Design a protein around this ligand. Structure first.
Ligand code: HEM
Ligand SMILES: O=C(CCCCCn1ccnc1)N[C@@H](Cc1ccccc1)C(=O)O
Length: 454
């Protein structure tokens, strides 16, 4: 079968289709029009966007396909280096860092992070407890303060103190401006236009800032000798069982940058979308708040209580089904192969997995794909293989998945225990796109149930 292709623009092929405020949503619309696979071409590039579980289940076969660096990741690699997210599987530093960091990211390690996560979550609750009568909450903003601070504290024992400020941290200013430049660079029809020399000069300056600040964090920890139980201690003291080698300081810096990207708006997006869906679905909100009250019987949650917030976990997975905050990942064929018995691929050919569209496959989820129903996730064995991929695939899947879900379950549980929520503006969903997704302008009012934290 010959796969369809969206409209073209002469020699620019499909590239101008990405010069839009909401490229992921544009690609979802194309998938709606063209179906489970379509070719997408740009100058010097060819990829194929997959949206059906039928094909994506084959793409997820690790003997046939390996992680590819998308153009976005190639550009992000300019400041994330050979960190875990931007390295090829065959690079020595991927497997080394993977082996070293897996024990830092397990459920067991979460027991060690829990008290630091609680510290930040309590700050979020206290902020909302202290709002005045008809003030409102800026949801993505506050969730990002929470997520950033949490990775800062658990990552390298650093307090961004985001609840004490409006202006971002200098590192964050440069990181967000660098990520903004990556997105802009994906949209440029002639990236060599001298009109972009200023953007390129700024990009290099923002990389220098990120490197200087993180290199000083590591140098300071090496100069103090302190043994905080955080990711940076683990990276300074860990050795790869395979090679017997530790990570070098350059690669530790890339890992820290990579975690700060992931733990910023990528993770806060999940909380923001989950709270949006809860306030738009009052019976689901009631059910989740009933669980929060039943389980969280102490002034602050224990690790074990967070694990018992089963329905809250289902809420989070159903938010990840509809709006996964890493909306695509790329793959390449390790050898010649045929997809779905119909689409021949040559070794090296690349694929894009359009996750939001996969999660709307009616053959998997039924006709109600657009409704918010956490009960879909009662039983993981009832979900077909590779139908749900918000954390990627295989050995290249999200190392941070337990971290993200634990911190999100904790704070969402605490939010539900301590407040009743009002959608006071009847907020109309507007998904702002960077390299991640957020409900721009989403606001709520939170009325305290007056349950103390002491
Ligand atoms: C809801 C929040 C998150 C989501 C939806 C998410 C999703 C993903 C996805 C889809 C990938 C695969 C990317 C690809 O195949 O190109 C990935 C990889 C990765 N993520 Fe996350 N992530 C989240 C939070 C985090 C956090 C909190 C961390 C660390 C603090 C993290 C660290 C990483 C790393 C290191 C990788 C690369 C793993 C490897 O390839 O060895 N992520 N994530
Ligand atoms: O794959 C991606 C990158 C996804 C993010 C990967 C992880 N991460 C997050 C922040 N840093 C890196 N994005 C899609 C959609 C898109 C197209 C053009 C412009 C923007 C977004 C694509 O490239 O097809």
């Amino acid at each position: 079968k010959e796969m369809p292709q969206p409209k073209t623009f002469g020699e620019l092929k499909n590239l101008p289709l990405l010069n839009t405020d909401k490229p992921v949503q544009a690609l979802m619309k194309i998938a709606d029009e063209l179906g489970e696979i379509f070719k997408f071409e740009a100058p010097g590039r060819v990829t194929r966007y997959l949206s059906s579980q039928r094909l994506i289940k084959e793409a997820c076969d690790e003997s046939r396909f390996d992680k590819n660096l998308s153009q976005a990741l190639k550009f992000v690699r300019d400041f994330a280096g050979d960190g875990l997210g931007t390295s090829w599987t065959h690079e020595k530093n991927w497997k080394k860092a993977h082996n070293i960091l897996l024990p830092s990211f397990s459920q067991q390690a979460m027991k060690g992070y829990h008290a630091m996560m609680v510290d930040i979550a309590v700050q979020l609750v206290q902020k909302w407890e202290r709002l005045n009568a008809d003030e409102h909450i800026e949801v993505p903003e506050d969730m990002t303060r929470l997520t950033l601070d949490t990775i800062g504290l658990c990552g390298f024992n650093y307090r961004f103190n985001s609840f004490y400020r409006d202006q971002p941290h200098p590192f964050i200013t440069s990181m967000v401006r660098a990520l903004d430049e990556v997105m802009n660079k994906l949209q440029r029809a002639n990236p060599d236009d001298p009109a972009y020399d200023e953007n390129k000069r700024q990009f290099q300056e923002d990389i220098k800032v990120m490197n200087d600040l993180v290199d000083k964090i590591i140098a300071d920890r090496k100069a103090s000798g302190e043994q905080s139980d955080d990711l940076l201690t683990h990276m300074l003291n860990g050795k790869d069982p395979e090679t017997g080698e530790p990570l070098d300081d350059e690669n530790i810096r890339y890992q820290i940058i990579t975690f700060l990207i992931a733990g910023h708006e990528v993770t806060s997006g999940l909380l923001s979308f989950a709270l949006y869906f809860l306030v738009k679905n009052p019976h689901v909100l009631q059910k989740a708040a009933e669980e929060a009250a039943r389980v969280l019987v102490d002034p602050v949650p224990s690790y074990k209580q967070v694990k018992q917030l089963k329905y809250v976990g289902m809420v989070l997975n159903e938010a990840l089904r509809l709006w996964p905050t890493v909306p695509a990942f790329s793959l390449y064929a390790k050898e010649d192969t045929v997809l779905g018995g119909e689409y021949p691929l040559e070794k090296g050919d690349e694929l894009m997995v359009l996750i939001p569209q996969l999660h709307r496959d009616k053959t998997i989820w039924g006709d109600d794909v657009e409704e918010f129903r956490p009960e879909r996730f009662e039983n993981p064995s009832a979900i077909p293989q590779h139908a749900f991929k918000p954390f990627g695939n295989g050995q290249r899947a999200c190392i941070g998945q337990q971290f993200a879900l634990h911190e999100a379950t904790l704070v969402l549980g605490m939010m539900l225990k301590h407040f009743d929520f009002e959608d006071h503006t009847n907020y109309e969903l507007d998904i702002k796109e960077t390299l991640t997704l957020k409900p721009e302008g989403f606001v709520v009012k939170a009325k305290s149930k007056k349950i103390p934290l002491l």
